[PDB]
């Protein structure tokens, strides 16, 4: 009587389902980087044409 | 980016740069997860990082 059950202890009020929050999806993206050139070496002038 | 910053923008515990151990390993793992979750603006995010 105190816990509001039946004669055999079965609950008189149906327990709520408590539907979960459920998982979510994941995402990824691209990443870039930048660089410069190398020092220009003075070409040793040959004799050819 | 990490090597250019020299672990200064990564941080370290009781050591300069970073020693090859579990603390830096976990830090790098969490950092990579954060980079993956960054999203499309992650490129610019790392750019000003």
Residue A44 in tokens? 């040793």
Task: Report the phi/psi class of residue A36: left, alpha or beta, with left for phi > 0 and alpha for psi in -120 to 50.
Answer: beta
Taking CA atoms, A48 is separated from A44, A45, B29, in Å, by: 12, 9, 58
As given in the structure block, the two tokens for residue A33 are 């980087």
- Elucidation technique: cryo-EM
Tokens of B43: 């490129």
Q: Which of B26, B41, B24, B31 is nearest to B1 (CA)?
A: B31
Give me the residue label for tokens 């970073």. Answer: B18
How far apart CA B14 and CA B25 sit, in angstroms, is 15
Structure tokens at B18: 């970073």
Mutate to test the interface with A, among B2, B37, B41 (most CBs of A within 10 A): B37
In chain A, what is the straight-line distance between the N-terminal and C-terminal CA atoms, in Å? 112
Is B16 in CB contact (< 8 Å) with chain A? Answer: no
Q: How far is A28 from chain B (nearest CA, A)?
A: 5
């Amino acid at each position: 009587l105190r816990h509001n059950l039946s004669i055999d202890g079965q609950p008189l009020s149906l327990a709520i389902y408590a539907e979960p929050t459920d998982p979510k999806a994941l995402l990824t993206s691209m990443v870039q980087a930048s660089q410069g050139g190398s020092a220009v070496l003075p070409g040793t002038l040959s004799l050819y044409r | 980016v990490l090597v250019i910053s020299g672990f200064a923008v990564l941080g370290a515990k009781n050591q300069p740069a970073g020693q090859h151990n579990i603390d830096t390993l976990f830090s790098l793992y969490r950092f990579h997860q954060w980079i993956n979750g960054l999203g499309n603006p992650g490129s610019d995010t790392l750019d000003m990082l």
